[PDB]
Amino acid sequence: DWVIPPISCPENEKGPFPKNLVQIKSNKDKEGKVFYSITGQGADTPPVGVFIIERETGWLKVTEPLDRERIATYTLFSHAVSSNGNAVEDPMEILITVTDQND
Amino acid sequence: FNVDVARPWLTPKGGAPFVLSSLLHQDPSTNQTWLLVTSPRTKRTPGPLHRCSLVQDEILCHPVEHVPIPKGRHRGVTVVRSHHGVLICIQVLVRRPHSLSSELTGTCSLLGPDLRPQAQANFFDLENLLDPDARVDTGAGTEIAIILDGSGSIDPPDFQRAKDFISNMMRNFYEKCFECNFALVQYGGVIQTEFDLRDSQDVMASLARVQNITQVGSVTKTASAMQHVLDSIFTSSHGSRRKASKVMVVLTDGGIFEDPLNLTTVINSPKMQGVERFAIGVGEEFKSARTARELNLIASDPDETHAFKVTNYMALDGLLSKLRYNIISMEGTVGDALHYQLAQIGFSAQILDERQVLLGAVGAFDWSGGALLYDTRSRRGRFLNQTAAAAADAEAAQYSYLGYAVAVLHKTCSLSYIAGAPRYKHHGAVFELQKEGREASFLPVLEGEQMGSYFGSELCPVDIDMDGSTDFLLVAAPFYHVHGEEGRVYVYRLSEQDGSFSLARILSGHPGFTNARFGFAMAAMGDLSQDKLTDVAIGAPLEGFGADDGASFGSVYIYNGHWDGLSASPSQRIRASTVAPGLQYFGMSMAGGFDISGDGLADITVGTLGQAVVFRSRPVVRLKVSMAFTPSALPIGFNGVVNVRLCFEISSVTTASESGLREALLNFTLDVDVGKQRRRLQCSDVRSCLGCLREWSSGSQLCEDLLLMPTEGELCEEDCFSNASVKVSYQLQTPEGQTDHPQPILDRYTEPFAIFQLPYEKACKNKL
Amino acid sequence: PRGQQEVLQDQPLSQGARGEGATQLAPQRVRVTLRPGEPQQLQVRFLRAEGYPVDLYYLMDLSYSMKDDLERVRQLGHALLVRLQEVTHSVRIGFGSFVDKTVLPFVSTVPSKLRHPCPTRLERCQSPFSFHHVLSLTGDAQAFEREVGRQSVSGNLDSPEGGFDAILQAALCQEQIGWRNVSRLLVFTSDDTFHTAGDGKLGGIFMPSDGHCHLDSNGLYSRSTEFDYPSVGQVAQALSAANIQPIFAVTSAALPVYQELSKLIPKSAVGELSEDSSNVVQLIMDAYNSLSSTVTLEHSSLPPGVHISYESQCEGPEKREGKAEDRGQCNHVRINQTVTFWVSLQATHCLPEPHLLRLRALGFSEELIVELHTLCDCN
Numbered sequence A: 001d002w003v004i005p006p007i008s009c010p011e012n013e014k015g016p017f018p019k020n021l022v023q024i025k026s027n028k029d030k031e032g033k034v035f036y037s038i039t040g041q042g043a044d045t046p047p048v049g050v051f052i053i054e055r056e057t058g059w060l061k062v063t064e065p066l067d068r069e070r071i072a073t074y075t076l077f078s079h080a081v082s083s084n085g086n087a088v089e090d091p092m093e094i095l096i097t098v099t100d101q102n103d
Numbered sequence B: 001f002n003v004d005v006a007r008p009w010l011t012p013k014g015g016a017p018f019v020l021s022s023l024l025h026q027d028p029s030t031n032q033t034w035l036l037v038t039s040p041r042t043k044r045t046p047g048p049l050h051r052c053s054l055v056q057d058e059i060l061c062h063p064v065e066h067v068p069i070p071k072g073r074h075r076g077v078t079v080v081r082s083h084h085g086v087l088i089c090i091q092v093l094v095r096r097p098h099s100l101s102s103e104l105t106g107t108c109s110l111l112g113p114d115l116r117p118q119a120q121a122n123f124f125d126l127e128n129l130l131d132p133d134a135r136v137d138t139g140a141g142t143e144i145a146i147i148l149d150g151s152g153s154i155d156p157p158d159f160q161r162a163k164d165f166i167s168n169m170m171r172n173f174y175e176k177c178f179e180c181n182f183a184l185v186q187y188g189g190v191i192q193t194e195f196d197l198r199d200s201q202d203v204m205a206s207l208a209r210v211q212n213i214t215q216v217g218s219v220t221k222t223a224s225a226m227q228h229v230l231d232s233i234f235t236s237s238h239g240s241r242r243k244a245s246k247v248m249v250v251l252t253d254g255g256i257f258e259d260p261l262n263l264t265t266v267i268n269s270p271k272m273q274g275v276e277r278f279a280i281g282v283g284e285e286f287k288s289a290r291t292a293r294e295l296n297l298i299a300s301d302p303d304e305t306h307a308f309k310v311t312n313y314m315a316l317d318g319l320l321s322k323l324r325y326n327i328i329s330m331e332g333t334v335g336d337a338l339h340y341q342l343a344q345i346g347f348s349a350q351i352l353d354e355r356q357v358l359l360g361a362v363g364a365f366d367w368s369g370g371a372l373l374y375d376t377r378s379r380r381g382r383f384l385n386q387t388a389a390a391a392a393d394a395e396a397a398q399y400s401y402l403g404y405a406v407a408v409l410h411k412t413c414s415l416s417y418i419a420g421a422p423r424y425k426h427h428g429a430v431f432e433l434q435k436e437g438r439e440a441s442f443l444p445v446l447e448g449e450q451m452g453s454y455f456g457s458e459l460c461p462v463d464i465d466m467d468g469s470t471d472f473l474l475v476a477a478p479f480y481h482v483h484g485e486e487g488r489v490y491v492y493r494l495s496e497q498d499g500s501f502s503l504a505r506i507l508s509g510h511p512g513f514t515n516a517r518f519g520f521a522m523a524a525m526g527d528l529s530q531d532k533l534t535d536v537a538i539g540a541p542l543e544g545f546g547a548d549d550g551a552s553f554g555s556v557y558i559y560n561g562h563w564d565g566l567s568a569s570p571s572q573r574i575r576a577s578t579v580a581p582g583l584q585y586f587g588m589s590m591a592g593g594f595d596i597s598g599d600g601l602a603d604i605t606v607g608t609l610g611q612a613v614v615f616r617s618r619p620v621v622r623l624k625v626s627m628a629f630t631p632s633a634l635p636i637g638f639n640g641v642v643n644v645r646l647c648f649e650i651s652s653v654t655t656a657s658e659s660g661l662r663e664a665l666l667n668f669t670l671d672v673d674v675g676k677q678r679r680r681l682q683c684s685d686v687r688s689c690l691g692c693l694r695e696w697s698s699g700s701q702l703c704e705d706l707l708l709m710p711t712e713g714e715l716c717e718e719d720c721f722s723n724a725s726v727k728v729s730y731q732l733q734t735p736e737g738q739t740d741h742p743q744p745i746l747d748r749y750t751e752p753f754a755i756f757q758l759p760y761e762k763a764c765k766n767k768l
Numbered sequence C: 001p002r003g004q005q006e007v008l009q010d011q012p013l014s015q016g017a018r019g020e021g022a023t024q025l026a027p028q029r030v031r032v033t034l035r036p037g038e039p040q041q042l043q044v045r046f047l048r049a050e051g052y053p054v055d056l057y058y059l060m061d062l063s064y065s066m067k068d069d070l071e072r073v074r075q076l077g078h079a080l081l082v083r084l085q086e087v088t089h090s091v092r093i094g095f096g097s098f099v100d101k102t103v104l105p106f107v108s109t110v111p112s113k114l115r116h117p118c119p120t121r122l123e124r125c126q127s128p129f130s131f132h133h134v135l136s137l138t139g140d141a142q143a144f145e146r147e148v149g150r151q152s153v154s155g156n157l158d159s160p161e162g163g164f165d166a167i168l169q170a171a172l173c174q175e176q177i178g179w180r181n182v183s184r185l186l187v188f189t190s191d192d193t194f195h196t197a198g199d200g201k202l203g204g205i206f207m208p209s210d211g212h213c214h215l216d217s218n219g220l221y222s223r224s225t226e227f228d229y230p231s232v233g234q235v236a237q238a239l240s241a242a243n244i245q246p247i248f249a250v251t252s253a254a255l256p257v258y259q260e261l262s263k264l265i266p267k268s269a270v271g272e273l274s275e276d277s278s279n280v281v282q283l284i285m286d287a288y289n290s291l292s293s294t295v296t297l298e299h300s301s302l303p304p305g306v307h308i309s310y311e312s313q314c315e316g317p318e319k320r321e322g323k324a325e326d327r328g329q330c331n332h333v334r335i336n337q338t339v340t341f342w343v344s345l346q347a348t349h350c351l352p353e354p355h356l357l358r359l360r361a362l363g364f365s366e367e368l369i370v371e372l373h374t375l376c377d378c379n
């Protein structure tokens, strides 16, 4: 299970960095320590680490400024593992849109 | 009388077999005689029947081959005999699936005249064997392990709902499944047993500890919980049974979290083989496919009807549909009526012909009874019972035990079966099969006179003159009470013209014993008196119980047949103490009438409790006695010699009488001039005539010449003109020495004396 | 010189239950001055104001057909004990139980039903047994009530119930049942016919029963499965040998079966265990009131030369024709009945001038004292 609102990050913001967009919240956290590892094109495959997540809290952060007009959307996933190494939540296909500036 | 209590043959004491009954059997086509003995099952006894024959003056025993094999406790071995074959029945126990009570019927094997096997019968599913048109001719449990998730991520309301599910399932399973036992476990974090299979023996306590369980939160360890359930609940160390079916009810949210053991490491493990699994989803967090996959992997292979929600209390049918039980109505409860479940067919038996046998059914229809007439060739039979259609109330006929004994009557026209019902109206009755129209049923013809006497528990038709008819019927009341249980045996003369029964005599044991149980064992022993009539034997196993040292106790009476019926008093009474020490309950089973000893005479067998005795029988010699005088008629005033001749000879001869006649002795006295105040004739050798003791040589003759003469002194002057009378009295004395043969005996029903006359010559025109 | 006889103390009769409130004999002291050839006489009287002791074994059926009738037996025990304890000071009451033999045709053998014989597992029940001695004869009434109010029902397969084994074992097991050898009553409860000798054949039991005790330390008749049920003759003989009077409190439906049994066991009585249960209590009171006694006058050894004799009179002018020592006894005394005696003393010669002796009823606490003064010399 997951608790995620719709996702978007505007174009070409001003720094500094990182900046918080949304939270990838698991569900079994009431029993403790559901760690994370975002993946997919955009985090762990070029373009490298444009989006990265903190391992315990779940904050999805933008690392450097964006533009849609080079890539329209950045699809992603999330591994979510417990402290014993076993997977907990299966990945959910986040899909972020850099919402156009009409330019 | 005939029976030779001097040299009784006994089976070895204590060791096998343990004889419960003994019966002699002779093969008509070979004239071989064996002493068959039935024994209960033990670690030593090889079977339920042995054949024992006399070799080196010792009874040696071996097992019969194709007889059925008893198993488990002893429950009854019947062996009956006829010149057509031997029939051996063994009461056996069988339990059917999902039945809470067991059946108890017979298994019977019919061997031929030579103890080879001929027919087989297994009286289970008796309704199949029955053919109600057959002409009657007359001429493991289950164990449920509840694994309940109190791991947290389950709010208390969901815990309470799961608790209610547990309680409702438990109550229904206890109500409608009897052999069901429960266990419970809770695995939030640590694994914590709440009650065990041993606790489930008390329904109320187990149901009471359900609604009291408290939650443990923490983390969701399903795999470790299941491994613990396999390793510490479904194990004999905690009351789990080997054969009982095993089931599980995982009541989980499907949220496995931080558990060392892969849940496939457990479901594919060796121990999960043969264990059913039901999953149930507590609460609602099934928003994703992972929970569904986990919950179904917990569920057994057919996911249909193995995954549910706590809200559907109808979830666990199929278990309640397949584990349903049925009870035989018992002593206050409702249930299936007793038809044939505990019939005990084969309790008594009678071989009628080479094809047909008649078996008692003491237990049929609430122990009313009956008798199954079984045609072994075609394997079909008819049930013969008392008719309940005359009045709708059949309750009056329950617990009659009709068929406790069975017999036949060889009337001049047709057979007529009879069956003892030793609890009819608490007296007992003897029934007779009567036939009318298209129906054949038992009706009460004889009735007892005392409560608890067991009148009709033993029957013995007797053909007193061996002519094909049945002249008397003996009916036993072994527990008749005057002071103690002395026993009693009625003697019913049987009418040739009408075929009805009329009482003739009532027989009772020797006075002085209060606990004889006279009438327990009756057997028509054929001909023992060597006179072509039928002799009977009646046992009294308890005669002598507790007397003196208690070395031995029991008795057997012999009733010689007579032209007008069974004798008034017994001709012999064999006592336990006079046979050999260690005989207890001597007289409980009897048979005889065949030559097992090696000479032409018939021999008897009396089985004690734990031994069998075999008695040879003695020849009966009846002596022809004749005489002559010299001079033939006493002259007038005779002072001269009165020479005598007294010739003895035998009147009936057999091979055994020839073998044994010639080592006993003859003893005869002469009494002269019987009845007078004074005698006319001396005895010239007083020592001789007044008593002699001779030995007998050969052939059949033994004669002696002895001398008399006129009395010494003045001769008589008051009775000179009348006759004299000479009386010879003979007795036969038998030494106890070790003569190989049975020594003879004089007939009991013939006078031991013979009288002659010695006339005198009167002075009239005619001397004599 | 001339003789004299005198009475030295006075004591009236009373009708108390206990010894202090009860009176057994005439006053305690008298005097007699004997002289050679001059007999003197004294008068005595006896009364049984106290009641005899009693012993009462309550033996009830615990098969399932009795579930509806158990209230009746539980009330019958209480209504019996109250009545008996209101009359006799020294009652003892025990308690035993029975179901049937543990072999197939009589009792189911499958383990599940052998543990829980009742139809449903929610029922409170107990495993089958043949005889279970629960409470040895005791004077503790509350113990009897507490125990009889605690037993649970068992199961069975056939309507006939084996209570004959229990009766025989109660008769034969005297040392551990607790009989006092005073007066015995057995109260047997059931609502079914009974098994008799011969029925064991159906279960494969061949060994005839034997007259010996077979109670384990816990009270169970464990070896029951190996012996046959006793015959009515054996039961009658055993009860007669032990002087036990049975009283069958049986249901109105099983009553016809037990009214024929009452004819064979001579002294027995049969009643109906109704909802009121006063008739059975009355039967048991009639059995208790049958107890009678023969009172004899004991006496002490006389001094040299002295002699003594007796005479007796029953209710009414009746005497006893047997002279001398026979007239020292009177028979057929029951509750609150009285008899009388005369004792004559004589002297042949004197040796001690003063002397004393004592007499009493046979085995009674109260006694009599006589002071003798034998004289030879003149006044």
Ligand SMILES: *[C@@H]1O[C@H](CO)[C@@H](O[C@@H]2O[C@H](CO)[C@@H](O[C@@H]3O[C@H](CO)[C@@H](O)[C@H](O)[C@@H]3O)[C@H](O)[C@H]2NC(C)=O)[C@H](O)[C@H]1NC(C)=O
Binding pocket: B029, B030, B031
């Ligand atoms: C087995 O024993 C029986 C009984 O003793 C034997 O039966 C007897 O058999 C004989 C013939 O073998 C029958 O007839 C006899 O034959 C001649 C005249 O032909 C004569 O010696 C006799 O008077 C007699 O009639 C005899 O009647 C018959 N006995 C009876 C009672 O039926 C049988 O033979 C024996 N079996 C074997 C195989 O030895």
Ligand SMILES: *[C@@H]1O[C@H](CO)[C@@H](O[C@@H]2O[C@H](CO)[C@@H](O[C@@H]3O[C@H](CO)[C@@H](O)[C@H](O)[C@@H]3O)[C@H](O)[C@H]2NC(C)=O)[C@H](O)[C@H]1NC(C)=O
Binding pocket: B337, B338, B339, B365, B368, B369, B383, B385, B386, B387, B388, B394, B397
């Ligand atoms: C003598 O034997 C006959 C059978 O040969 C007995 O009659 C039978 O009695 C049974 C009693 O249970 C009847 O069974 C019926 O079966 C079903 C299933 O329960 C149901 O329709 C009835 O409630 C009843 O129980 C059976 O119909 C009846 N007749 C036959 C032909 O079998 C008879 O009771 C025996 N008499 C005595 C005195 O024992």
Ligand SMILES: *[C@@H]1O[C@H](CO)[C@@H](O[C@@H]2O[C@H](CO)[C@@H](O)[C@H](O)[C@H]2NC(C)=O)[C@H](O)[C@H]1NC(C)=O
Binding pocket: B667, B668, B691, B693, B729, B730, B731
């Ligand atoms: C031959 O038999 C007669 C009886 O038929 C025996 O007579 C007995 O003799 C004894 C003394 O020896 C007497 O006391 C008996 O009264 C006689 N009669 C009976 C019936 O016993 C006689 O003894 C026998 N002869 C021998 C040598 O034993």
Ligand SMILES: *[C@@H]1O[C@H](CO)[C@@H](O)[C@H](O)[C@H]1NC(C)=O
Binding pocket: A086, A087, B262, B263, B264
């Ligand atoms: C469990 O076993 C499966 C294969 O059966 C494997 O793919 C998986 O990684 C193992 N571990 C877990 C936590 O499921």
Ligand SMILES: *[C@@H]1O[C@H](CO)[C@@H](O)[C@H](O)[C@H]1NC(C)=O
Binding pocket: B194, B209, B212, B213, B214
């Ligand atoms: C049961 O109730 C008792 C008090 O009667 C309590 O001590 C205990 O914790 C409760 N829980 C269980 C599981 O027995």
Ligand SMILES: *[C@@H]1O[C@H](CO)[C@@H](O)[C@H](O)[C@H]1NC(C)=O
Binding pocket: C174, C175, C178, C179, C180, C181
């Ligand atoms: C009763 O009397 C008998 C016979 O004298 C004696 O053996 C026994 O000990 C006494 N007491 C009991 C309880 O049987």
Ligand SMILES: [Ca+2]
Binding pocket: B463, B464, B465, B466, B467, B468, B469, B470, B471
């Ligand atoms: Ca005839």
Ligand SMILES: [Ca+2]
Binding pocket: B527, B528, B529, B530, B531, B532, B533, B534, B535, B560, B561
């Ligand atoms: Ca004869």
Ligand SMILES: [Ca+2]
Binding pocket: B595, B596, B597, B598, B599, B600, B601, B602, B603, B616, B617
């Ligand atoms: Ca012979």
Ligand SMILES: [Mn+2]
Binding pocket: A031, B151, B152, B153, B154, B219, B220, B253, B255, B257
């Ligand atoms: Mn959890």
Ligand SMILES: [Mn+2]
Binding pocket: C065, C066, C067, C068, C069, C191
């Ligand atoms: Mn009842």
Ligand SMILES: [Mn+2]
Binding pocket: B331, C063, C064, C065, C066, C156, C158, C159, C161, C191, C192
């Ligand atoms: Mn009952």
Ligand SMILES: [Mn+2]
Binding pocket: C099, C100, C106, C156, C157, C158, C159, C160, C161, C162
């Ligand atoms: Mn019963």
